Enzyme design. Sequence first.
Site, PDB file in Angstrom:
ATOM      1  N   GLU A   1       0.830  -1.205   0.000  1.00  0.00           N
ATOM      2  CA  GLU A   1       0.000   0.000   0.000  1.00  0.00           C
ATOM      3  C   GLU A   1       0.877   1.274   0.000  1.00  0.00           C
ATOM      4  O   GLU A   1       0.634   2.192  -0.770  1.00  0.00           O
ATOM      5  CB  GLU A   1      -0.958   0.038   1.192  1.00  0.00           C
ATOM      6  CG  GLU A   1      -1.983   1.170   1.053  1.00  0.00           C
ATOM      7  CD  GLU A   1      -2.837   1.372   2.289  1.00  0.00           C
ATOM      8  OE1 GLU A   1      -2.292   1.369   3.398  1.00  0.00           O
ATOM      9  OE2 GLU A   1      -4.056   1.559   2.166  1.00  0.00           O
TER      10      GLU A   1
ATOM     11  N   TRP B   1      -8.175  -2.685  -0.851  1.00  0.00           N
ATOM     12  CA  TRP B   1      -8.904  -1.533  -1.417  1.00  0.00           C
ATOM     13  C   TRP B   1     -10.081  -1.924  -2.304  1.00  0.00           C
ATOM     14  O   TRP B   1     -10.794  -1.073  -2.837  1.00  0.00           O
ATOM     15  CB  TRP B   1      -7.940  -0.575  -2.138  1.00  0.00           C
ATOM     16  CG  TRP B   1      -7.260   0.368  -1.161  1.00  0.00           C
ATOM     17  CD1 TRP B   1      -5.990   0.284  -0.685  1.00  0.00           C
ATOM     18  CD2 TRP B   1      -7.866   1.496  -0.508  1.00  0.00           C
ATOM     19  NE1 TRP B   1      -5.762   1.293   0.232  1.00  0.00           N
ATOM     20  CE2 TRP B   1      -6.895   2.057   0.347  1.00  0.00           C
ATOM     21  CE3 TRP B   1      -9.148   2.064  -0.544  1.00  0.00           C
ATOM     22  CZ2 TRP B   1      -7.152   3.184   1.150  1.00  0.00           C
ATOM     23  CZ3 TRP B   1      -9.411   3.207   0.262  1.00  0.00           C
ATOM     24  CH2 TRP B   1      -8.415   3.745   1.093  1.00  0.00           C
TER      25      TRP B   1
ATOM     26  N   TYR C   1      -5.394   9.369  -1.613  1.00  0.00           N
ATOM     27  CA  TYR C   1      -4.041   9.600  -1.102  1.00  0.00           C
ATOM     28  C   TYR C   1      -2.911   9.853  -2.108  1.00  0.00           C
ATOM     29  O   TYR C   1      -2.466  10.985  -2.252  1.00  0.00           O
ATOM     30  CB  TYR C   1      -3.656   8.417  -0.244  1.00  0.00           C
ATOM     31  CG  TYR C   1      -4.589   8.164   0.914  1.00  0.00           C
ATOM     32  CD1 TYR C   1      -4.545   8.969   2.053  1.00  0.00           C
ATOM     33  CD2 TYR C   1      -5.474   7.092   0.886  1.00  0.00           C
ATOM     34  CE1 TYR C   1      -5.390   8.724   3.145  1.00  0.00           C
ATOM     35  CE2 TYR C   1      -6.305   6.806   1.954  1.00  0.00           C
ATOM     36  CZ  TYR C   1      -6.254   7.618   3.097  1.00  0.00           C
ATOM     37  OH  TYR C   1      -7.074   7.345   4.165  1.00  0.00           O
TER      38      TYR C   1
ATOM     39  N   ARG D   1       7.257  24.325   8.187  1.00  0.00           N
ATOM     40  CA  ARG D   1       6.257  24.183   7.120  1.00  0.00           C
ATOM     41  C   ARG D   1       6.450  22.895   6.292  1.00  0.00           C
ATOM     42  O   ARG D   1       6.079  22.839   5.132  1.00  0.00           O
ATOM     43  CB  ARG D   1       6.343  25.378   6.179  1.00  0.00           C
ATOM     44  CG  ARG D   1       6.180  26.700   6.866  1.00  0.00           C
ATOM     45  CD  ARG D   1       6.597  27.841   5.973  1.00  0.00           C
ATOM     46  NE  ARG D   1       6.807  29.078   6.744  1.00  0.00           N
ATOM     47  CZ  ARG D   1       6.490  30.306   6.307  1.00  0.00           C
ATOM     48  NH1 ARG D   1       5.916  30.478   5.116  1.00  0.00           N
ATOM     49  NH2 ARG D   1       6.714  31.376   7.066  1.00  0.00           N
TER      50      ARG D   1
ATOM     51  N   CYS E   1      -8.578   9.288   5.741  1.00  0.00           N
ATOM     52  CA  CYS E   1      -8.660   9.181   7.221  1.00  0.00           C
ATOM     53  C   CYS E   1      -7.425   9.757   7.838  1.00  0.00           C
ATOM     54  O   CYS E   1      -7.526  10.547   8.764  1.00  0.00           O
ATOM     55  CB  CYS E   1      -8.827   7.745   7.699  1.00  0.00           C
ATOM     56  SG  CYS E   1     -10.374   6.989   7.112  1.00  0.00           S
TER      57      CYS E   1
ATOM     58  N   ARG F   1      -8.085  12.217  11.102  1.00  0.00           N
ATOM     59  CA  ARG F   1      -9.450  12.713  11.418  1.00  0.00           C
ATOM     60  C   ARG F   1     -10.421  11.639  11.986  1.00  0.00           C
ATOM     61  O   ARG F   1     -11.400  11.939  12.683  1.00  0.00           O
ATOM     62  CB  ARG F   1     -10.115  13.358  10.171  1.00  0.00           C
ATOM     63  CG  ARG F   1     -10.416  12.368   9.046  1.00  0.00           C
ATOM     64  CD  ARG F   1     -11.533  12.811   8.084  1.00  0.00           C
ATOM     65  NE  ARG F   1     -11.735  11.736   7.102  1.00  0.00           N
ATOM     66  CZ  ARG F   1     -12.652  10.770   7.214  1.00  0.00           C
ATOM     67  NH1 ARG F   1     -13.519  10.751   8.240  1.00  0.00           N
ATOM     68  NH2 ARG F   1     -12.715   9.822   6.279  1.00  0.00           N
TER      69      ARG F   1
ATOM     70  N   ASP G   1     -10.545   3.825  13.233  1.00  0.00           N
ATOM     71  CA  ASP G   1     -11.076   2.586  13.748  1.00  0.00           C
ATOM     72  C   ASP G   1      -9.919   1.944  14.538  1.00  0.00           C
ATOM     73  O   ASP G   1      -8.920   1.511  13.958  1.00  0.00           O
ATOM     74  CB  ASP G   1     -11.543   1.702  12.601  1.00  0.00           C
ATOM     75  CG  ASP G   1     -12.154   0.411  13.081  1.00  0.00           C
ATOM     76  OD1 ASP G   1     -11.681  -0.172  14.090  1.00  0.00           O
ATOM     77  OD2 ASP G   1     -13.096  -0.046  12.427  1.00  0.00           O
TER      78      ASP G   1
HETATM   79  O1  LIG Z   1      -6.586   4.271   6.945  1.00  0.00           O
HETATM   80  C1  LIG Z   1      -7.724   4.286   7.482  1.00  0.00           C
HETATM   81  N1  LIG Z   1      -7.852   4.209   8.814  1.00  0.00           N
HETATM   82  C2  LIG Z   1      -9.018   4.197   9.440  1.00  0.00           C
HETATM   83  O2  LIG Z   1      -9.068   4.058  10.670  1.00  0.00           O
HETATM   84  N2  LIG Z   1     -10.180   4.357   8.674  1.00  0.00           N
HETATM   85  C3  LIG Z   1     -11.500   4.228   9.303  1.00  0.00           C
HETATM   86  C4  LIG Z   1     -12.029   5.309  10.199  1.00  0.00           C
HETATM   87  C5  LIG Z   1     -13.525   5.035  10.044  1.00  0.00           C
HETATM   88  O3  LIG Z   1     -13.900   3.931  10.894  1.00  0.00           O
HETATM   89  C6  LIG Z   1     -13.689   4.648   8.565  1.00  0.00           C
HETATM   90  C7  LIG Z   1     -13.862   5.802   7.578  1.00  0.00           C
HETATM   91  O4  LIG Z   1     -15.198   6.288   7.722  1.00  0.00           O
HETATM   92  P1  LIG Z   1     -15.530   7.869   7.787  1.00  0.00           P
HETATM   93  O5  LIG Z   1     -14.730   8.442   8.942  1.00  0.00           O
HETATM   94  O6  LIG Z   1     -16.996   7.931   8.045  1.00  0.00           O
HETATM   95  O7  LIG Z   1     -15.074   8.380   6.490  1.00  0.00           O
HETATM   96  O8  LIG Z   1     -12.468   4.004   8.260  1.00  0.00           O
HETATM   97  C8  LIG Z   1     -10.083   4.896   7.422  1.00  0.00           C
HETATM   98  C9  LIG Z   1      -8.968   4.421   6.678  1.00  0.00           C
HETATM   99  N3  LIG Z   1      -8.935   4.517   5.257  1.00  0.00           N
HETATM  100  O9  LIG Z   1     -10.124   4.752   4.593  1.00  0.00           O
HETATM  101  O10 LIG Z   1      -7.906   4.417   4.592  1.00  0.00           O
HETATM  102  O1  LIG Z   2      -1.575  32.671  14.526  1.00  0.00           O
HETATM  103  C1  LIG Z   2      -0.333  32.478  14.583  1.00  0.00           C
HETATM  104  N1  LIG Z   2       0.213  31.846  15.631  1.00  0.00           N
HETATM  105  C2  LIG Z   2       1.512  31.633  15.764  1.00  0.00           C
HETATM  106  O2  LIG Z   2       1.959  31.099  16.790  1.00  0.00           O
HETATM  107  N2  LIG Z   2       2.355  32.014  14.713  1.00  0.00           N
HETATM  108  C3  LIG Z   2       3.812  31.911  14.861  1.00  0.00           C
HETATM  109  C4  LIG Z   2       4.492  30.574  14.825  1.00  0.00           C
HETATM  110  C5  LIG Z   2       5.882  31.027  14.379  1.00  0.00           C
HETATM  111  O3  LIG Z   2       6.606  31.539  15.518  1.00  0.00           O
HETATM  112  C6  LIG Z   2       5.610  32.155  13.371  1.00  0.00           C
HETATM  113  C7  LIG Z   2       5.356  31.725  11.926  1.00  0.00           C
HETATM  114  O4  LIG Z   2       6.618  31.365  11.362  1.00  0.00           O
HETATM  115  P1  LIG Z   2       6.804  30.031  10.468  1.00  0.00           P
HETATM  116  O5  LIG Z   2       6.357  28.859  11.321  1.00  0.00           O
HETATM  117  O6  LIG Z   2       8.265  29.979  10.178  1.00  0.00           O
HETATM  118  O7  LIG Z   2       5.918  30.248   9.319  1.00  0.00           O
HETATM  119  O8  LIG Z   2       4.421  32.746  13.857  1.00  0.00           O
HETATM  120  C8  LIG Z   2       1.820  32.217  13.472  1.00  0.00           C
HETATM  121  C9  LIG Z   2       0.578  32.909  13.489  1.00  0.00           C
HETATM  122  N3  LIG Z   2       0.092  33.581  12.331  1.00  0.00           N
HETATM  123  O9  LIG Z   2       0.986  33.848  11.311  1.00  0.00           O
HETATM  124  O10 LIG Z   2      -1.080  33.923  12.184  1.00  0.00           O
END
Ligand SMILES: O=C1NC(=O)N([C@H]2C[C@H](O)[C@@H](COP(=O)(O)O)O2)C[C@H]1[N+](=O)[O-]
Ligand SMILES: O=C1NC(=O)N([C@H]2C[C@H](O)[C@@H](COP(=O)(O)O)O2)C[C@H]1[N+](=O)[O-]
Lengths: 264, 264
Positions: free
Chosen positions: A58, A80, A94, A127, A146, A166, A169
């Site tokens: 995968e 899949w 992905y 970043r 996921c 996000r 399972d």
């Molecule tokens: O890599 C993965 N790992 C996971 O834990 N899942 C799981 C989380 C959920 O139980 C389900 C996706 O359903 P939704 O969250 O409703 O989209 O599939 C999703 C998955 N995937 O779709 O590749």
């Molecule tokens: O809402 C915010 N909160 C934050 O903590 N920052 C901070 C994190 C870092 O110290 C800096 C952004 O610099 P870079 O991570 O190098 O892009 O600005 C970023 C910031 N913002 O740009 O809106």
Amino acid sequence: MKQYLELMQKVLDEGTQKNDRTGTGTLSIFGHQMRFNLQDGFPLVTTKRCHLRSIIHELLWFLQGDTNIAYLHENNVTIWDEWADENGDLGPVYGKQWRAWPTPDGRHIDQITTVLNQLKNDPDSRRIIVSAWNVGELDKMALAPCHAFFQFYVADGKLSCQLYQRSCDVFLGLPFNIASYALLVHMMAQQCDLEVGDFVWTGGDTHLMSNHMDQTHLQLSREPRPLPKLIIKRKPESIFDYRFEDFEIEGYDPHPGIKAPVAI
Amino acid sequence: MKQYLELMQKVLDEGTQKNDRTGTGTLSIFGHQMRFNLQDGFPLVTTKRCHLRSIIHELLWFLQGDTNIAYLHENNVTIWDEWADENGDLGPVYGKQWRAWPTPDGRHIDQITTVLNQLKNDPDSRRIIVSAWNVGELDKMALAPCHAFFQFYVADGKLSCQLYQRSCDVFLGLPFNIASYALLVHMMAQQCDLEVGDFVWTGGDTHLMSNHMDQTHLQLSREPRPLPKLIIKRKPESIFDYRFEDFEIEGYDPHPGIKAPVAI
Ligand SMILES: O=C1NC(=O)N([C@H]2C[C@H](O)[C@@H](COP(=O)(O)O)O2)C[C@H]1[N+](=O)[O-]
Ligand SMILES: O=C1NC(=O)N([C@H]2C[C@H](O)[C@@H](COP(=O)(O)O)O2)C[C@H]1[N+](=O)[O-]
């Protein structure tokens, strides 16, 4: 694994009953984070046997930017199949987003190469990110990613990675997601001449299917064995030139497999 | 706040010395998570005075999809000035991505409305997400979003939210980021007829500037006061119809302000 079994117990103890789109109940918590020092060993669940073969294939498939299951079939990997259409297409899931994120101006962004450039030329960057969460292409995906978003980090010659997942399972998905990202961190570190650091897993809706209560109880009774060791048998000239046989897992002695059935 | 001061101490105790793009050192950790029960009170830092006025105006500006600082100027809010160009443009930063994410096919996606639809019609969804991390537009932004990705979650009539913040200045940035997202959760809950749940903050590179050692020591000596209470004086007919004067903070008794200077 210790961290994994604590999550499992925590969902049982603290989960709220939540329905999902399948109609099966879940027990769900929101927001959890675990950490794996990759120098302590490869984080493959020992309290049930995990077949690494699928994980590897995968991941190699993701890195190719391939979203058709044909490659997985050549290798008799069927994980899949339930999502693929008659052609074996998944939509722009992905791999497509990793390697070829489409911009409104007609470009395709290679996020994997971008990250390799940054790791090599600007390792202190805050970043260094790969996102699969392409809002304009979600409708076209068989399902929303996921494991959606990840960030690399370099301190003291060590490559760490944090994944935002996000939806998780805990029984079927998680063991497989942790191994897959740990393997990626090892390949990335190798290519950048860095040591491995931490894999940090962060969850959104982190859940157990309600029909997995017995399997969960069974697993929670088992004692974690020592972690195995990952061996990479060669250094390819590119992150895209890995092959299945380059990887070996040593010292893996899991308790027996547990089947977890799903509703349709 | 308790959780905030523990993070502050943890960076001092555990941070590694890391350079940043400014050239100032930082002390940095990677991966941290904190939780705020919003029913326990509004999470505004009490161990130093925070001016809420700016937070509110910025959030209202984000929700308008406005990326020109003109609105902030009408209100004498100057927090975005150092990044704006001569026209007062920031590029397609936060608000543009929230309200009008551009697709390759010529659409503009309203992620805020999408999330409101889902919260109202499919509250068990594990896909209720807003992303500012638009890979194809990063080059055009004055800077990459720090607070990059957030997820909503509904269980038991309670709205929770998790933020993934890729980069965090613990001293200057964080107090302001927590208040801003807590306020958004309160406005979202109001519009969806839900109660507030948890705000879960997740950090990537979470750091203190090395020239903020004295200020950090000073703040860590101070005792947190009780949290204030947020009052919303009216219910607008839309998440886009809030006004500055709709919000009141009650019971806020902070220790004095601390100035933290920056290198150029
Ligand atoms: O890599 C993965 N790992 C996971 O834990 N899942 C799981 C989380 C959920 O139980 C389900 C996706 O359903 P939704 O969250 O409703 O989209 O599939 C999703 C998955 N995937 O779709 O590749
Ligand atoms: O809402 C915010 N909160 C934050 O903590 N920052 C901070 C994190 C870092 O110290 C800096 C952004 O610099 P870079 O991570 O190098 O892009 O600005 C970023 C910031 N913002 O740009 O809106």
